[PDB]
From a paper:
DHODH is a rate-limiting enzyme catalyzing the fourth step in pyrimidine de novo synthesis. It catalyzes the dehydrogenation of dihydroorotate (DHO) to orotic acid (ORO) to finally generate Uridine (U) and Cytosine (C) to supply nucleotide resources in a cell. To identify potent and low-toxicity DHODH inhibitors (DHODHi), we previously conducted a hierarchal structure-based virtual screening against ~280,000 compounds library towards the ubiquinone-binding site of DHODH. Thus, by targeting DHODH, the single key enzyme in viral genome replication and immune-regulation, a dual-action of DHODH can be realized in fighting against a broad spectrum of viruses and the corresponding pathogenic-inflammation in severe infections.
By virtual screening, we identified two molecules with the same novel scaffold, which is obviously different from those of Leflunomide/Teriflunomide or Brequinar. The X-ray crystal structure of DHODH in complex with S416 further verified the binding mode of S416 at the ubiquinone-binding site of DHODH that is similar to S312. Compared to S312, the addition of the methyl group of S416 can perfectly occupy the small hydrophobic subsite formed by residues Met43, Leu46, and Gln47 on DHODH to form favorable Van der Waals interactions, contributing to the enhanced binding affinity of S416. The binding free energies for S312 and S416 were −45.06 kJ/mol and −46.74 kJ/mol, and the binding equilibrium dissociation constants (KD) were 20.3 and 1.69 nmol/L, respectively. Additionally, the two inhibitors exhibited a clear trait of fast-associating (kon) and slow-dissociating (koff) inhibition, providing themselves as ideal drug candidates with a high level of target occupancy. The extremely high SI of S416 may be due to its high binding affinity and favorable occupation of the ubiquinone-binding site of DHODH with faster-associating characteristics (kon = 1.76 × 106 mol−1·s−1) and slower dissociating binding characteristic (koff = 2.97 × 10−3 s−1), which will reduce the possibility of off-target in vivo. The results in all further confirmed that compounds S312 and S416 inhibit viral genome replication via targeting DHODH and interrupting the fourth step in de novo pyrimidine synthesis. Notably, S416 is reported to be the most potent inhibitor so far with an EC50 of 17 nmol/L and an SI value of 10,505.88 in infected cells.
Numbering used by the authors: 32 to 396
Write the structure that this text describes.
């Protein structure tokens, strides 16, 4: 509570005054990679444990893709108190991404806009980085701290499906789950991989490559979607996910929309918008996808989570797990313990025995 206020009121506003957002992001990854973090003194209650995607999750609060793009800070993120870590997006070949500046703060909106453009060390570098800690990760996973890997595609690739297939082959064996991110707003054409006969063809190839891995090295496969889909796109995705036995959905990526009421000077920058203005658009997308999949497809809920109330709203809408990113940039590492403490308190107040009991509760009212 002391360092929650110190981080929110003094340290983060001081860092944002001294460093542009991408510099601050880079420094945050370096500090995290060295374990230079405040005490994550919140101890996970049994109430927070979730069993989904073939794994135990000690707590349902994960770090979303895009913070640790290149798998440099995984151990530091568990030390921060995340129940699970997602690295990436990782592209087959190394690529630089967009020219700088490409990350923009909207302080008045508690939002960020980014157009990183899948800056990636590439699969080989990330493969060797995860191999160096593979057994340490096996023990973390067994102790309820799973690892996800988010797979992207290179800007100049002539075959999107083959880029994802390469990622399944190279990083699948090192991951508890993989994510096919057909929802970055910052690679031309990527989101059109969300339409039907082509999405079926893409996901069929990804699942075949996954099913070709040895049993102990066989990850869950999730599809990560945009909040910007049409009703037709969402019904098509739900249909294909059920038909192919996709293991879960991540709902949602950043929005290319600009909700009415943004105040930030940088609101008209090109890129994906994250944080508070995405929150309820994300929650509503979770609700719709949970209904279209009859509650049979696990959802990881993400977009504008900054409190236990935000986490519980996504859980009651249909999420089994949640992720956050943008809240960490505003409030720093103490926001993780804050979300967990508030979520545990709210579950008790609303008469839930644990997270599991709350999943999709709004659909049963
Ligand atoms: C700076 C930045 C970089 C991101 N890069 C990625 C990415 O590489 N892959 C991805 O799937 N999502 C990426 N995202 C999206 C987040 O994973 C998340 O879906 C989105 O930001 C909503 O969560 P939030 O409001 O808690 O930040 C990125 C988000 C931000 C803010
Ligand atoms: C600056 N910052 N992230 C910044 C950041 C990251 C991504 C995008 C934008 C920004 C931004 O500045 O607008 C963090 N710092 C930590 C952190 C990590 C370890 C120890 C102490 C801290 Cl405060 C986590 S995220
Ligand atoms: O630009 C990126 O790398 C990136 C940004 C974002 O918001 N989402 C994503 O999937 N990729």
């Amino acid at each position: 509570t002391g360092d929650e206020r110190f981080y929110a009121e003094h340290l983060m506003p001081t860092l944002q005054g001294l460093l542009d957002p991408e510099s601050a992001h880079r420094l945050a990854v370096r500090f995290t990679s060295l374990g230079l973090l405040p005490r994550a003194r919140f101890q996970d209650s049994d109430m927070l444990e979730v069993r989904v995607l073939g794994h135990k999750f000690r707590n349902p609060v994960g770090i979303a893709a895009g913070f640790d793009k290149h798998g440099e800070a995984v151990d530091g993120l568990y030390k921060m108190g995340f129940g699970f870590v997602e690295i990436g997006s990782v592209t087959p070949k190394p690529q630089e991404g967009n020219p700088r500046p490409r990350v923009f703060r909207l302080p008045e909106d508690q939002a960020v806009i980014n157009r990183y453009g899948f800056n990636s060390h590439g699969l080989s570098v990330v493969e060797h980085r995860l191999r160096a800690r593979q057994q340490k990760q096996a023990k973390l996973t067994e102790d309820g701290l799973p690892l996800g890997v988010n797979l992207g595609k290179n800007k100049t690739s002539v075959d999107a499906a083959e880029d994802y297939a390469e990622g399944v082959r190279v990083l699948g064996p090192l991951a508890d789950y993989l994510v096919v991110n057909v929802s970055s707003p910052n690679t031309a054409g990527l989101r059109s991989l969300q339409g039907k006969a082509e999405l079926r063809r893409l996901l069929t190839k990804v699942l075949q490559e996954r099913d070709g891995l040895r049993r102990v090295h066989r990850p869950a496969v999730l599809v990560k979607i945009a909040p910007d889909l049409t009703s037709q796109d969402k019904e098509d995705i739900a249909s294909v996910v059920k038909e192919l036995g996709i293991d879960g959905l991540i709902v949602t990526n950043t929005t290319v929309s600009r909700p009415a009421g943004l105040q930030g000077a940088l609101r008209s920058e090109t890129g994906g918008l994250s944080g508070k203005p995405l929150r309820d658009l994300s929650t509503q997308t979770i609700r719709e996808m949970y209904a279209l999949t009859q509650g049979r497809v696990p959802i990881i809920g993400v977009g504008g989570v900054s409190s236990g109330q935000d986490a519980l709203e996504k859980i009651r809408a249909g999420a089994s797990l949640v992720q956050l990113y943008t809240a960490l940039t505003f409030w720093g590492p103490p926001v993780v313990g804050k979300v967990k403490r508030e979520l545990e308190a709210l579950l008790k107040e609303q008469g839930f025995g644990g997270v599991t009991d709350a999943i999709g509760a709004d659909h049963r009212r």
